[PDB]
Amino acid sequence: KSCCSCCPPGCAKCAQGCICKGASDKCSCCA
Ligand SMILES: [Cd+2]
Ligand SMILES: [Cd+2]
Ligand SMILES: [Cd+2]
Ligand SMILES: [Cd+2]
Numbered sequence: 136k137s138c139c140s141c142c143p144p145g146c147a148k149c150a151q152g153c154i155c156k157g158a159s160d161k162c163s164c165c166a
Pocket of ligand 3: 137138149
């Protein structure tokens, strides 16, 4: 399971609880 749709199963900003929230299709914590 990924955790979001703005970061694939290989992001280096979602290895400590998906922080991507408040923006769909894009984020600002892994941008
Ligand atoms: Cd994301
Ligand atoms: Cd991420
Ligand atoms: Cd995530
Ligand atoms: Cd993010």
